[PDB]
């Protein structure tokens, strides 16, 4: 077979990303996996004259005892964005998010049958480290389209189309979208009928080598800002209410506080019960109405990155907002739960990323309420996805969490 | 002997040609010394003569205790050479090694000079011995082997040695060989006789690959001094640490001491450095004398006491769990020890780090665990089981209510005071029967002056003036006023998200002395409820302290 030439981003070099430290059992799982890939010609050992590096990890992958190798091509993907995105971009379908049922299927094995351009191989270099650095790292590079590299689906596009052609012709109303190593399959069929079509799809993929996760985008609704409903309002209660309402505005147009504040004149005790002058009740009355509805005026801009912020609410609950301009929320939601904070945050991240792929065809850059190092040591312990989003580490603002509870 | 090993292909950086630096004229004695050195190197295959057809050049020098040495200045070729993969990604920690019955070190003779250089690259290694008084040409050579001082040498050497060792390793998996620069450490659990025998078999497999190594009678006996360590087959310690006796200490003397104490801290437990370090703050010249503060003198004395009498660590038994214990040594100082068998330390360490501006022992302990967890993954490939001076209820109460996520590996409480604890708590609800203080601060950016104050629901008010402040400082000054004038039980309402965030995280220590004064007050109270309201709304007491505090300062 022939190879498609690949170039980096002009006056841009390859990735030189440090390999993070791995545990004994992940190192052994990788040595085993890599020894088998090499035997099959998928990757080859390399010399000191390759100064590139991309990190590598081992994950389990949902309800499986088997170890999966996971390559972090976040940097290489950044250095090849003109190739996979402009040159060979994969259109994302707007109808996908509308389907009642969306099934995710792992189609990454497809890639190892396609060879990689010889002059690009070197940039796919990675290392298997040893414990205590007692031996030198095992160095390899790829000979075939690697999993996790956004150039692989871009290149394999034409073959995927040939493969899905009969199934698509026979089922004009089912939407199939490829994102990285997965296929997203949506339909409006009744569930047993949807699962039946999925098995049929697996039969076609099976004829070409290839060999799931179940969403319901159409059932992805609200997650407003809620206001309290109560009898007996305190000075302290009112203040909290205007604080939240005051913050609700900036994002929501119409929020009014004058009447709520008029209730609070003078220098009162916090524990002072204060009867809501009907003038007021009509205010949070219309505010409550404002808050139940959608933004208005906020649209997705494809030329902009998606950001996702997450707040730890406590007792298994986490809140999140996705946006491009701060306060211009494209989406808000929640995620709820042996589970520590890291394991739960890890699942919330994967959940938000998958919805984001379904909705916009792209992943968000996450702002994580956690110490970098803690995240770094723990994330792969519970990571199951084959992609990795971008992330930063932040310190949650005090009030932000209460406003989203 | 130059190794029969395959060659590593080398390239110049993209869009660059080889070096072309002119040779400075040398003295006659230098030219002569160089002519002798090269003819000998050429008569051994290390270098080869070339002509005026090759156009590259690198300076050569000659230096002298009375024997001549050749010096090739590869600076320019180095800048044009491609980057390579890193030689070592880290160095092993002795605590991570396994105990060994017999251990030997073979130093590789003429290391670099035994490995061939890519044929297509030799050309850029061209150098010229100049003619006498430069009148005439020059003798021109190029390298056939890895040059001393060349960028790619270390990596190409190690890669070659890795390729050469594989065959042996496969046939002897029960044997450890560690590659370090030009040395080879060889360890086994064999009886002295069969170890000596496997060495010889190694020394000969290397010999077949063009690499010489010292024979028995010539190879060193443990303990092996390596990387600042002293290694025995059954134990390890740091190399001999001498803390000088000095009447006067200069910055350079304190810096060196601090580095030796930091190095010893890997195995001598309880080593302290904070008071000695405080002295290096500000600083004058490396030569200037620094009087030792009291504190600095107590720390030194305490360190001196810890250091008299050797201490050694044991090696790693991969069949057993690792236990890490941590103790609070004082304000911001933590000390830890790692063992597998109670009290036989593999290693020790200390942690001090201030993460942020305001902090608490709960957050510091948890940061210390993180630092140890990471170090463990590195040294042993597994996390340890921790023993912490913090009660389980304390930890879960904190982690549970805090906004940041966390996860510690498996741990158990251990009663070694001081125990970690939270010093005060804020109320979840307003206190009935408590005076309410509405606080506020204001600062003028032009003049840098401001005012801090309060108005209570029970009649009081106060405004204080401040002279070289900031808004942030006024808002904190305001909260402090309310805590001074209030007596146990109080409700404080601020419009400062900044001051709120700080207090809500239950700080026990801060970089800000004002913050420390607030903390000292908070610990004195019975009950404190603290709440926030948006500024510039009609909000009662707030609008009043705002106008009070704004007067003249905006
Ligand atoms: N790999 C090991 O587990 C190991 N263990 C040792 C114990 C004592 C001595 Br002396 C050397 C050793 C060695 S070694 O010789 O390989 N080498 C010493 C420097 C770092 C590793």
From Swiss-Prot, chain B:
Impact reported for residue 74 to L: Confers multi-NRTI resistance
Result after altering residue 62 to V: Confers multi-NRTI resistance
Compartment list: Virion
Effect caused by changing residue 65 to G: Confers multi-NRTI resistance
Result of altering residue 208 to K: Confers resistance to lamivudine and zidovudine
Residue ranges annotated for the Reverse transcriptase domain, each copy included: 44-231
Annotated consequence of substituting residue 187 to C: Confers resistance to efavirenz and nevirapine
Residues binding Mg(2+) 1: 107, 182-183
Mutation effect (residue 44 to D): Confers resistance to zidovudine
All copies of domain RNase H type-1, residue ranges: 431-554
Additional comment: Error-prone enzyme that lacks a proof-reading function. High mutations rate is a direct consequence of this characteristic. RT also displays frequent template switching leading to high recombination rate. Recombination mostly occurs between homologous regions of the two copackaged RNA genomes. If these two RNA molecules derive from different viral strains, reverse transcription will give rise to highly recombinated proviral DNAs.
Name of the protein in its database record: Reverse transcriptase/ribonuclease H
Organism: Human immunodeficiency virus type 1 group M subtype B (isolate HXB2)
Classification lineage: Viruses, Riboviria, Pararnavirae, Artverviricota, Revtraviricetes
Gene that this sequence comes from: gag-pol
């Amino acid at each position: 077979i022939e190879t498609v030439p690949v170039k980096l981003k002009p006056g841009m070099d390859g990735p030189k990303v440090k390999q993070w430290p791995l545990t004994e059992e992940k190192i052994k799982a990788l040595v085993e996996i890599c020894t088998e890939m090499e035997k099959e010609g998928k990757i080859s050992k390399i010399g000191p004259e390759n100064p590139y590096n991309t990190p590598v990890f081992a994950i389990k992958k949902k309800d499986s005892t088997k170890w999966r190798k996971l390559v972090d091509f976040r940097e290489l993907n950044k250095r090849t964005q003109d190739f996979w995105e402009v040159q060979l971009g994969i259109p994302h379908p707007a109808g996908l998010k509308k389907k009642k049922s969306v099934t995710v299927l792992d189609v990454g094995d497809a890639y190892f049958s396609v060879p990689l351009d010889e002059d690009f191989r070197k940039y796919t270099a990675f290392t298997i480290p040893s414990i205590n650095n007692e031996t030198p790292g095992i160095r390899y590079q790829y000979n075939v389209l690697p999993q996790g590299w956004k150039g692989s689906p871009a290149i394999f596009q034409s073959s995927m189309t040939k493969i899905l052609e009969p199934f698509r012709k026979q089922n004009p109303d089912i939407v199939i979208y490829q994102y990285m190593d997965d296929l997203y399959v949506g339909s409006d069929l009744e569930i047993g009928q949807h699962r039946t079509k999925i098995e049929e799809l697996r039969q076609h993929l099976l004829r070409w080598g290839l060999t799931g996760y179940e969403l319901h985008p159409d059932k992805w609704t609200v997650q407003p800002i809620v206001l309290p409903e109560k009898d007996s309002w305190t000075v302290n209660d009112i203040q909290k209410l205007v604080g939240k309402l005051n913050w609700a505005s900036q994002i929501y147009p119409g929020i009014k506080v004058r009447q709520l504040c008029k209730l609070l004149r003078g220098t009162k005790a916090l524990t002072e019960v204060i009867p809501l002058t009907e003038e007021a009740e009509l205010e949070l009355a219309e505010n409550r109405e404002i808050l139940k509805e959608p933004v208005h005026g906020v649209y997705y801009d494809p030329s902009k990155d998606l950001i996702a912020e997450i707040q730890k609410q406590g007792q298994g609950q986490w809140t999140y907002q996705i946006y491009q301009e701060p306060f211009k929320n494209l989406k808000t939601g929640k995620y709820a739960r042996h589970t520590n904070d890291v394991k739960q945050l890890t699942e919330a991240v994967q959940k938000i990323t998958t919805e984001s792929i379904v909705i916009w065809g792209k992943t968000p850059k996450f702002k994580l309420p956690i110490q970098k190092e803690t995240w770094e040591t723990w994330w792969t312990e519970y990571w199951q996805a084959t992609w990795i989003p971008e992330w930063e580490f932040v310190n949650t603002p005090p009030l932000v969490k209460l406003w989203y509870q | 002997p130059i190794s029969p090993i395959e060659t590593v292909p080398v390239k110049l950086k993209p869009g660059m040609d080889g070096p072309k630096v002119k040779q400075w004229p040398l003295t006659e004695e230098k030219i002569k010394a160089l002519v002798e050195i090269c003819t000998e190197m050429e008569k051994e295959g290390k270098i080869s003569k070339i002509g005026p057809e090759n156009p590259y050049n690198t300076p050569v020098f000659a230096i002298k205790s009375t024997k001549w040495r050749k010096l090739v200045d590869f600076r320019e070729l180095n800048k044009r050479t491609q980057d390579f993969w890193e030689v070592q990604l880290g160095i092993p920690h002795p605590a991570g090694l396994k105990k060994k019955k017999s251990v030997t070190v073979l130093d590789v003779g003429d290391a670099y000079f035994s490995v061939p250089l890519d044929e297509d690259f030799r050309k850029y290694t061209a150098f010229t011995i100049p003619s006498i008084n430069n009148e005439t040409p020059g003798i021109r050579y190029q390298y056939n082997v890895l040059p001393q001082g060349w960028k790619g040498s270390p990596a190409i050497f190690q890669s070659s040695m890795t390729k050469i060792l594989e065959p042996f390793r496969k046939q002897n998996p029960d044997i450890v060989i560690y590659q370090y620069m030009d040395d080879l450490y060889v360890g086994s659990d064999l009886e002295i006789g069969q170890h000596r025998t496997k060495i010889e078999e190694l020394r000969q497999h290397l010999l077949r690959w063009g690499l010489t190594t010292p024979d028995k009678k010539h190879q060193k006996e443990p303990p092996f001094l390596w990387m600042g360590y002293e290694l025995h087959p059954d134990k390890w310690t740091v190399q001999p640490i001498v803390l000088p006796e000095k009447d006067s200490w200069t910055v350079n003397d304190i810096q060196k001491l601090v580095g030796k104490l930091n190095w010893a801290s890997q195995i001598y437990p309880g080593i302290k450095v904070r008071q000695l370090c405080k002295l290096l703050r500000g600083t004058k010249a490396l030569t200037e004398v620094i009087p030792l503060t009291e504190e600095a003198e107590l720390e030194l004395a305490e360190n001196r006491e810890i250091l008299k009498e050797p201490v050694h660590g044991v090696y790693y038994d991969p069949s057993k769990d690792l236990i890490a214990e941590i103790q609070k040594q004082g304000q911001g100082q933590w000390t830890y020890q790692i063992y597998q068998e109670p009290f036989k330390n593999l290693k020790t360490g200390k942690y001090a780090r201030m993460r942020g501006a305001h902090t608490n022992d709960v957050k510091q302990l948890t940061e210390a665990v993180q630092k140890i967890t990471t170090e463990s993954i590195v040294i042993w490939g597994k996390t340890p089981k921790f023993k912490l001076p913090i009660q389980k209820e304390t930890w879960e109460t904190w982690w549970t209510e805090y906004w940041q996520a966390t996860w510690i590996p498996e741990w158990e409480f251990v009663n070694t005071p001081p125990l970690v604890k939270l010093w005060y708590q804020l109320e979840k609800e307003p206190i009935v029967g408590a005076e309410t203080f509405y606080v506020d601060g204001a600062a003028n950016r032009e003049t840098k002056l401001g005012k801090a104050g309060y108005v209570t629901n029970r009649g009081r008010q106060k405004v204080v003036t401040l002279t070289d402040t900031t808004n942030q400082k006024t808002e904190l000054q305001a909260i402090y006023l309310a805590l001074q004038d209030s007596g146990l039980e109080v409700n404080i309402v601020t419009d400062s998200q900044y001051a709120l965030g700080i207090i809500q995280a239950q700080p026990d220590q801060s970089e800000s002395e004002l913050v420390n004064q607030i903390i000292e007050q908070l610990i004195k109270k019975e009950k404190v409820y603290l709440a926030w309201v948006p500024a510039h709304k009609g909000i009662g007491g707030n609008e009043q302290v705002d106008k009070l505090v704004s007067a003249g300062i905006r």
